[PDB]
């Protein structure tokens, strides 16, 4: 696959994560075929640790808004996200920038696709994942 | 930049991280121009949280080997990694798969570059970051 990197910033991030998991200075950084990284750390004494480094996601709360005084009928669970994404991309090719269920009740779902022409397409879908409206 | 994704697996990973940071079901996922993601969660009650989701690295120890009975003269600190990477890539274009300082003392540093021809190049460098040997 796309094993390795041309990014020194990325190798440094991998070395820094590894140094966070054990003692010693970095003596080796090696890409595994599964696209994880192994880093060797070695103490002054000569003691060795091998550390696995993986992609992870970190979540932090940004804002909070209390119960206005309704809840969501529909939600973006995994199944619904997979359905919207295939529907959004069938309609227009590009990168999904936005999904929501906010929507407008006859069109409960929205997606935005960013296309190579750096042009942004807002799509409105029915409960049945049918395209009901676009905005280009 | 390359904002968004065509990957439903990636959107699901973003939704899952977010659900790990607050209560409620996912009602929106939106890409920011800095290439972070914002996710809205909404409770049955109608209470909203916005959650920032970021790339992170996670490190876990894999193996341990005690002080054999020497330590490393040289180490891959950030400066040394930036130096090796530019030297490795000047010599051959492609993805770095390996850096080490293990080396052979007149050639203390090693890099492997994976090239588009899916061909793997081992480079040996002096203390001065000069190319001293290749293996193709
Ligand atoms: Zn899941
Ligand atoms: Zn469902
Ligand atoms: Zn809508
Ligand atoms: Zn819309
Ligand atoms: Zn419309
Ligand atoms: Zn640093
Ligand atoms: Zn240094
Ligand atoms: Zn060497
Ligand atoms: Zn070598
Ligand atoms: Zn040689």
Q: How far is the CA of B18 from the centre of ligand 1 (A)?
A: 12
The closest of B6, B71, B129 to A94, measured between CA atoms, is B6
Contact B42 A71 (CB under 8 A): yes
What are the CB-based long-range contacts (under 8 Å, 24+) for B66-72? B66/A47, B67/A43, B67/A45, B67/A46, B67/A47, B68/A46, B69/A46, B70/A46, B71/A42, B71/A43, B71/A44, B71/A45, B71/A46, B72/A25, B72/A27, B72/A42, B72/B101
- State the ligand closest to the CA atom of A107: 3
Question: Does residue A92 contact residue A113 with C-beta atoms inside 8 Å?
Answer: yes
Min Cα–Cα distance to chain A from B115, Å? 10
Q: Which residues make beta-bridge pairs with A52?
A: A38, B60
Nearest chain A residue (CA) to B45:
A71
Tell me if A50 and B63 make a contact (CB, 8 A cut-off).
yes
Are the beta carbons of B75 and A27 separated by less than 8 Å?
Answer: yes
Please identify every residue whose CB atom is under 5 Å from ligand 3, which is an ion. A 103-104, 107, 110, 124
Q: Does the domain at residues A78-135 carry the CATH identifier 3.40.640.10?
A: no
> What b-and-e string marks burial along A58-89, b requiring 16 or more CB atoms within 10 Å of the CB?
ebeebeeeeeeeeebeebbeeebbebbbebbb
Q: How far is B42 from chain A (nearest CA, A)?
A: 7
Instruction: Kindly list the residues from chain B whose CB atom is less than 8 angstroms away from the CB atom of residue A66.
Output: 47
Interrupted backbone of chain A, residues before each interruption (C–N > 2.5 Å): 69
Taking an 8 Å cut-off on Cβ atoms, the answer to whether A15 and B81 are in contact is yes
Residues 6+ apart with CB under 8 A from B31: A95, A96, A97, A98, B3, B4, B5, B37
Sequence ranges of chain B with CATH classification 3.10.450.40: 78-135
Q: Strand A131-135 and strand A48-65: pairing?
A: unpaired
Rounded Cα gap, residues A16 and A32, in angstroms = 18
**Contact between A99 and B3 using a beta-carbon 8 Å cutoff:** no
């Amino acid at each position: 696959t796309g094993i390795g990197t041309a990014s020194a910033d990325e190798l440094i991030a991998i070395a820094d994560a590894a140094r966070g998991a054990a003692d010693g200075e970095v003596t080796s950084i090696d890409a595994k075929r599964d696209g994880t990284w192994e880093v060797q750390l070695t103490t002054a004494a000569g003691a060795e640790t091998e550390v696995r480094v993986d992609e992870a996601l970190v979540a932090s709360v940004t804002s909070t808004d209390a119960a206005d005084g309704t809840g969501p009928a529909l939600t973006l669970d995994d199944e619904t996200i997979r359905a919207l994404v295939s529907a959004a991309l069938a309609e227009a090719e590009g990168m999904i920038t936005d999904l929501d269920v906010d929507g407008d009740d006859v069109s409960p779902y929205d997606a935005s696709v960013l296309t190579s022409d750096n042009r942004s397409i807002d799509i409105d879908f029915s409960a049945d994942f049918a395209v009901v409206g676009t905005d280009i």
